[PDB]
Symmetry: C3
C-alpha cells in the first residue's frame, strides 16, 4: 500500500439469500514489466494473475490478428503435487483450453480491426478454492489487464456465471450451488450507452436437469433462457464499472490510447475504384440460387473486374480482392434485408436436406451417419467397464469423466489437404459443446454401468458441424442401446442486423431491421451479426453457444429467434425419430 499498489478496486455481486461474492482487482504490485498486470481475487481466497503484453515490432507477414491467450492452471493452486511422471505441469488440459477459448471469443472482436501486433494474455491461476471455478474470473482478469495495458481495447468486458437455483439466477455460483442448479450460463458483455450489451453466451444444462424438473423445478425453456440473458446484465454492469468508470483500476491511471499501427485492406482508393464499377454489376447475379448456374455470373464478373482493375493497382491484388469480397458481402446482406431471400436460394426457415442412417459400421457398439446438405457426420460410440472412464486430474472439481466425446475433423472433410494429428483448439471446443449437450440426458452410472466414448468424425463440412455432430452422436447412442431420457437435436442459426432506409414509411428514414435465418452455411457465418447454436430435446434447451458484437438486441427478437430454433430443432428431432425410435438390442459385446 506504499505506491502504485492502492488501485485496489472492488466489486460486489449480491445473490440475495446465497450471500455476496466480493470480486477484487489490484495492480502495480505483481508483474510490473508487463504492459498490463491485474491480480483478481474472488471471496479473498481465489487469487489469479493476468498479464497482457504486446510485441514491440509490428508484424506484416501475418494476415490475421495474432492474439494468443494462454491460461496456466499451475497445480500448486490446488495444494497437490502434479500427477505427471515428471511431476510438472505439461500441456494444457481440456479445462484450460476451454477457458482460453471462452476468453478469446469476446475479447477478439473487442480489438480494433487491422491490428497486426502480437498480443499475448497469460492468465496464471495462483490460487483457487476446491469449490470454485476460474474461467469467468479469467475473463474478467484478462479484460481488466488489457484495459490497463493501454492497448486499443474496447470497453472492458465483464463476465459472470449465472445459474437457475429454484427460480432465481445466482451469479458466480459455488460448485455445490450449481449442483442444485438447473441451467448453467456464462455471459460476457460490455456497456455501450449506460446499458449492457451481450457479447458471448455459453449455456449448458446441469447433469441433474431431469431429476430437478421431475422433482418440482421448471425446465429451461427458451423464455427462461431469455429471462436469464436479462438476469446477468446487472452483474456484468457492476463488473464493468469496477474497471475504469469511476477512477478505479484503469480509472486511477486514466490510460489514454497509445499509438499502434493498423493495416486495413482497403482504405479509400481500391474501395472506391471497385465500388464505382462494381455496385451496379450485382443487380440480379444471385437469382438462380444454385451452385451450377447462379455462381456462373458472380464468378465471371469477379474475373472481369479483376482483369479490368489491373491497370493502376499493380501489386495490390489482395487489396482489390478484399474490397470485392466486402462489396459482395454488403450487397448480399442488403439482399437479405430487403428481398428477404438468401444466397443459397432458401428461406429463413428452410432446414437443409436431412437424412439420418443408423448402424452403418459393423462390429462397432453404435454407429450413425447424419447428413444435412453438404454437412455429414459419422458418429461411433463404444462401451467398456467403469474402470475405463477417464481419470481427469486438474483444478476442476470433477475427478472422473464417464462420458468422453472426441470430435475429429480430418482435413478431407472440407476437401483441402492439411495435417492430421493433435486436434486444434476449435475441435476441443466443438467436442466440449457436444459433450455438454449430451450430458443432461445420459442415464445415471448405477442405472447404466458402462463408460461411454463417442468419436464424431466429420466426413463432410460446410460450417457449424458441431450441431450435426450432436445429432449424429445421439443417433449413435440410441443405436448402441443406451437408455436416454429423450432424444436430442441441435442446429446453428444466424441473425443479420442492419440499418436500412425506408422511403414508403413517411420519408427516407433509416430503421434498424433484423433477419433471423436457419441453418447457417459456411459462407453465411460471416454474412450475419449474431450467430448462435441451439441444441436440446423437445422439452428444454441443453447447449447454447452465442457470440456477437451487436450493441444489444430487443428481448422480442431474441425470443422469436429462440422460438424458430425450437421449431427447427423439432423438425430435426422428427427426422431423427422416423429412422430410429427406440434403443436397439445391445451389441454382442454386452455381458449377461
Amino acid at each position: 500500500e506504499i505506491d502504485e499498489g492502492v488501485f485496489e478496486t472492488t466489486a460486489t455481486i449480491d445473490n440475495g439469500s446465497f450471500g455476496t461474492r466480493t470480486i477484487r482487482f489490484e495492480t502495480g504490485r505483481l508483474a510490473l514489466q508487463a504492459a498490463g498486470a491485474v491480480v483478481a481475487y474472488l471471496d479473498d481466497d481465489n487469487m489469479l494473475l493476468s498479464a497482457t503484453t504486446a510485441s514491440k515490432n509490428p508484424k506484416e507477414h501475418f494476415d490475421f490478428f495474432p492474439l494468443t491467450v494462454d491460461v496456466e492452471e499451475r497445480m500448486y493452486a490446488a495444494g497437490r503435487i502434479p500427477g505427471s511422471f515428471f511431476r510438472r505441469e505439461g500441456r494444457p488440459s481440456t479445462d484450460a483450453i476451454l477457458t482460453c477459448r471462452l476468453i478469446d471469443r469476446p475479447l477478439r472482436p473487442s480489438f480494433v480491426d487491422g491490428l497486426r501486433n502480437e498480443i499475448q494474455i497469460v492468465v496464471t491461476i495462483l490460487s483457487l478454492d476446491p469449490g470454485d471455478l476460474y474461467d469467468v474470473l479469467a475473463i474478467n482478469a484478462a479484460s481488466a489487464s488489457t484495459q490497463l495495458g493501454g492497448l486499443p481495447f474496447s470497453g472492458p468486458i465483464g463476465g459472470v456465471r449465472v445459474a437457475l437455483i429454484d427460480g432465481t439466477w445466482v451469479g458466480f455460483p459455488t460448485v455445490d450451488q450449481i449442483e442444485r442448479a438447473v441451467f448453467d450460463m456464462v455471459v460476457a458483455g460490455r456497456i455501450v450507452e449506460g446499458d449492457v450489451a451481450i457479447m458471448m453466451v455459453e449455456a449448458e444444462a446441469t447433469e441433474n436437469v431431469v431429476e430437478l424438473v421431475e422433482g418440482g423445478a421448471q425446465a429451461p425453456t427458451e423464455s427462461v433462457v431469455a429471462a436469464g440473458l436479462e438476469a446477468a446484465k446487472p452483474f456484468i454492469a457492476a463488473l464493468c464499472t469496477a474497471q475504469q468508470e469511476l477512477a478505479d483500476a484503469a480509472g486511477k491511471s486514466g490510460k489514454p490510447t497509445v499509438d499502434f499501427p493498423v493495416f486495413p485492406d482497403y482504405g479509400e482508393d481500391v474501395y472506391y475504384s471497385v465500388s464505382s464499377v462494381a455496385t451496379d454489376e450485382l443487380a440480379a447475379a444471385l437469382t438462380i440460387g444454385g451452385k451450377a448456374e447462379r455462381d456462373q455470373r458472380i464468378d465471371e464478373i469477379k474475373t472481369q473486374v479483376v482483369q479490368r482493375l489491373a491497370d493502376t493497382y499493380e501489386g495490390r491484388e489482395k487489396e482489390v480482392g478484399a474490397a470485392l469480397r466486402a462489396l459482395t458481402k454488403k450487397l448480399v446482406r442488403q439482399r437479405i434485408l430487403t428481398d428477404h431471400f438468401r444466397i443459397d436460394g432458401r428461406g429463413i426457415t428452410d432446414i437443409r436436406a436431412l437424412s439420418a442412417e443408423v448402424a452403418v459400421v459393423p462390429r462397432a457398439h453404435g454407429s450413425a451417419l447424419f447428413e444435412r446438405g453438404e454437412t455429414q457426420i459419422l458418429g461411433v460410440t463404444t462401451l467398456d467397464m467403469i474402470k475405463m472412464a477417464q481419470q481427469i486430474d486438474s483444478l476442476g472439481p470433477e475427478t472422473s469423466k464417464r462420458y468422453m466425446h472426441h470430435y475429429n475433423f480430418p482435413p478431407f472433410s472440407t476437401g483441402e489437404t492439411g495435417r492430421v494429428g493433435s486436434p486444434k483448439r476449435r475441435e476441443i471446443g466443438h467436442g466440449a459443446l457436444a459433450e455438454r449437450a449430451l450430458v443432461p440426458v445420459l442415464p445415471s452410472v448405477e442405472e447404466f454401468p458402462y463408460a461411454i466414448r463417442q468419436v464424431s468424425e466429420a466426413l463432410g463440412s460446410n460450417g457449424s458441424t458441431s450441431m450435426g455432430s450432436v445429432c449424429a452422436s445421439t443417433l449413435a447412442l440410441l443405436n448402441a442401446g443406451v437408455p436416454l431420457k429423450a432424444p436430442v437435436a441441435g442446429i446453428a442459426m444466424g441473425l443479420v442486423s442492419d440499418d436500412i432506409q425506408v422511403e414508403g414509411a413517411v420519408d427516407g428514414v433509416v430503421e434498424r431491421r433484423f433477419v433471423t435465418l436457419t441453418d447457417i452455411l459456411g459462407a453465411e457465418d460471416a454474412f450475419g451479426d449474431m450467430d448462435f447454436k441451439v441444441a436440446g430435446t423437445k422439452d428444454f434447451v441443453t447447449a447454447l453457444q452465442l457470440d456477437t458484437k451487436l450493441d444489444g438486441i430487443p428481448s422480442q427478437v431474441l425470443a422469436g429467434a429462440l422460438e424458430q430454433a425450437k421449431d427447427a430443432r423439432l423438425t430435426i428431432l422428427e427426422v431423427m425419430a422416423e429412422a430410429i425410435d427406440r434403443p436397439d438390442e445391445m451389441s454382442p459385446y454386452a455381458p449377461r
Copy 2:
C-alpha cells in the same frame, strides 16, 4: 434405398481354405474430398480411404510432397483407448508400417515433377480381430486415388499371400498365419493384362523352423519365386475390380482439372549438357581408377557449369540436375556394356567386410559390423520377461518379446541433422530387421527373456538395414541367446534396360538385366529395381523389393536371388569365423531360472 453407391466386387479364391470377397463403395462417404472409397472385406471389415489435392502447387518444395496417413481409430477394435487421455494420439508402429506399405508403390505412380501437395488419409472404421488391414489399405488408397482425378499411373492393387502346405492362400487371417511359413505382401499393377509387381515385403513366420522340420518345405528362393508368381491372379482381380469400367468419369469422380508439372531439366539445359559434355564423362568412367575418379568428375562438373553459365542465367540448379542425369545415363550404359561398377568391384564382389564382437564393455551383448564405409554398432540387452513391450492397438499382437530399435544419428553420413524422435524411415528399417531376426529366436519357455536390440548406425553409405541385421545376430550370439541359426543379410539390386545393336540389321533391341551386389546410395540412384534379402544358410527370413519395371522374367529373378544367396553365404561364413556359438551369459545379465 438411395442410388449413388457404385459397388464393385472382387473374388479371392483360396481353394479349401475358403473364398473371400473385396467390395468397393464410392459416392456415399466423404463427398467433399477429391476422391473417396469405402473398402469392405468379408462383410465385416470396413475402412475409408480418402485422397485430396492442394488447390495450389508447392513450388517451394524440392520433392513431390505426398503424405500417406492411416488413422487406426481404436473404436474399430471395440475398446476405449488405454491411454491416460483416452484418445489416440501419435501413430503406433503398425500405422507407420502401413503408411510405408501404401507409400512405397503408390509414390512412383505419380508423374515425375508433380508439385501439388497430396494427402491420403486412410481411416480404419471396423476391423475383425482376426484379419489384417494393411494390404486392404493399399487397395483402398489406390482406388481412392484413381477416382480422385489425379495424375495417377494406374490401380496398384495388392494382396497378402501366405504359404500353407504348398498352397499360396491369398488374404489369410491371423489364425491361418500360424499354420503358414511365409508371408508375401505383394502390390502391383497390370499393364497389358499381365501384372507388373511394384513392391514385395516378405517375412518368414515365427514358426518357420518348427514347421520346416515338421514336413513343410523351407522358404527357399525358388519357393519365394513361386509365391511371387502365385499372387499374380489376385493382383489382376483386385486391379480390375479397382478399375472396373471407366469409373473415374463413367461411374464416380469429377471432370478433370489439369495439375501443373515442374520438371527439373525440361529441354534446354539437358540438350546442351548432353551435346557438350558426353565424351569427357566416358573418358572419366573408363579411367579405371576409384581414387582418381573424383579429380576428373568434379572438375568436369565445375567446368561444364562455368562454360554453360553464359546462355542460361539463373539455371545453375537446372544445369546441375541435367549433368546428374547425363552421368546417370552414361553410368547405366557403362554397367550394361562394360560390366563395371563405379566402386571398381565385380558384380558379385562384396566390399571390405569385417565383424568384431564384444566391443562395448559392461553391456549384455555388443557387436560391430563394417562393410566398406557402412559401420553398425549393435547392442543387445537382456532384461526380465515383464519388461517386454505391452503394445496395444488394432493389431492382434498384444506384446513384443523382441524389439529392434534402429538409431540413425546424423553423424552417420556426416550431416548435421536433428537428434530426437525417430522418423518413419528408421521405424521401417527397425521393423525389417526385427522381422528378419524373429524366426531364428529361442522359444519363450526354453529362454524366458525380453530382448531389446539396439542398432546404432555409426557410419553410412546407404542401405544399412541388412548390415544392422548382421550386427544384430552377431550381438545376439555374443549376449548368449541360443540362435536357431545365424542369419545374414545383403542389399542386392540390378540395372535393367534395352540395348540396340546392328548385328542383325538394326532394330535389335535386347532387354538386358545386370545384377550387382553391395549397392550404395549411388547404386540406388542408378539401379532400376533394388531389393534386400536376408536369411540363414538354409532359408530366407526377410525380403524387401521395390521396383517400377513393367516386367522381369523368372530367369533373372532366380539368378539374382541365387547370387543374393551366395553373398549371404559368404557373409555368414565371415560372421561364423567371428563368433560361432552362443557363449556364456554376461555377468551383469540376470538369471531368473
Copy 3:
C-alpha cells in the same frame, strides 16, 4: 582379438590422474575406429569400464539467416549403457532427461566461447553414452570427449578443453570421485579450462555442496568457505593440465588424427570500415553523454544518438543499418567498460558494492502451502512451495546414481517477465539449468526424510526479470520454505556478481607499462552482463557457500582478486540474509491445508 593389434589409423592416448591415497584414474582417448564418417570422432574410456563416443560435425554451407553461432550439443544417454530396458511404455529413449540437459549445458558453457567469433556454420556435437559404471558419473568425461572430438575435426575451434570434477574429502581434493566418495565429500567442483602459456586458463566451473555438508562439517571436516573454494580451484589446475595435454598429443599436421583445416568462412558484424567511422564521428559526444549519470537521461540521449548518427551515416554505407547499430552498441559497451575501470561508476548510477532495492514479502499467495515474493531491484520473483506426502516424489530412472528426487525445484520464466512475447510451453534449456542451480543451492540446508517426511516442490515463477534471476529464485525459495514451515538448517541467500578486467598504459615512469586492472561489482544487471569480462553467481548460508557458478573469458586471474570477489560475495549475501531474516527467520507453523504425515 581385441583391436587386431592396432596397426591402423586408430590412435590412443592416456592421461593418468594421480589421486593419491584414495586411488588413481586413467582417462583414455581413442580415435580412428568408430564413426569414421563424422568430421571428428573420439571414444573416451575411464577406468576401462566407462566408455562413451563423441562425434563433432559441421555443415558444408553456413546458414545465413541466423544472427548468432548455431552450435548444438546432444547428450544421447542410451539406456543400454545401464543394462536396463527403458521403463517407458514405448520402451525407447524418449525426450532427454534433466541430467542429460544439464550435461549439455555443462559441455556448452566453455565450448561456446572457444569457437571463433562470427562463425555461422552449424556445428553439432553428439556424445553417446555407450557404457557406464553403476557408481560413476559421465558429464566431466563427456566434456573431455566433446573437446577432443572437436579438436580432431579441424574446425576453427581453438584450444583443447580439459574438464575435471574435484571433490574434497577430509581436506584432500580428489579428481573424478566415485559416487561413494562424493557421498563422503563436503564440496564438489566441476571445473573446465584450457592451457594458454604452459598454465591453465580457467573457463567454467559449477560448484555444489553435497547433501550431507552440515553433518560432515559438524563431524570435523573443514567447511566449504571461500578460502576452501579457492583451494579447490587451485587443486584442479594439474588435472586440467593433464587432461588437456592428453588431448593435445593427438597432434595435427604430423601424421596423427589431426587433419588439415579447410577454409571456414566467418561472418562478422562490423568488420573494418563502419566501426572506424562510428568510432571517429561518434566518440566524443558518446563519451560526454555518460557524464550526467541520470538513468532517464541515458535513455533520452541514447534514443537521440541511435536515431541521428544512423541517419548521418546513412549516406556512404547503405544497406547496413543493422551493422551501424552493432558498431554503436559496441562503442557504448567499450566506453562503459573504460568508465568502470577508470572512475568506478556503473550504468545504474550505483557504486561498485552497492546492492539493489531489497524487498522480501512472505505469505503472498493465499491457500498455498508456502508462498514468498522477493524483489531485488526491478527483479520480482514469486516462489510457491507445496508440501505433500512422500509418495509424490519423482520416481526417475536413468544412468545416474539417483533414483528419487525428493526435493524438486521448477523455475518458470513466462515471456511477460521481460516485457516481450513468446510461447508458454515446454521449459527451455536455460530454465532447466536455472532450476537445477537453485535446487543444488537449496539441497545442503534441507531437512532429512526422518525429521520432515514430506516431498518438497518449489515453483519459482519469474514475474519480472532483468537478468541473473537464479539467485533471486534461491532467496525466494528459501523464504517460501521458511513460510511453509520446513525446518531449515540455516537460511541461504544468493547473489550474482560480475568482474571487468582490462588494461591501461601507465606513462608516469615515461615507460608506459600496460597493466591489467580488475573491478568487481555486485548485483549484476541485464546490460552489465554484456560488458563484464567475467560473470559468476555465489549462493551460500551464513557460514558456507552451498552453490557456485563461473563462466569466464580471461586467461587466468590471480588468487588475490578471486578471494576479494568471494569476500564481496560473502558481504552481499550477509546483507541479503539479514533482510530476509527481518522478513522471516524461523520455521513457523504449517498451513492447515498441508497434509500431516
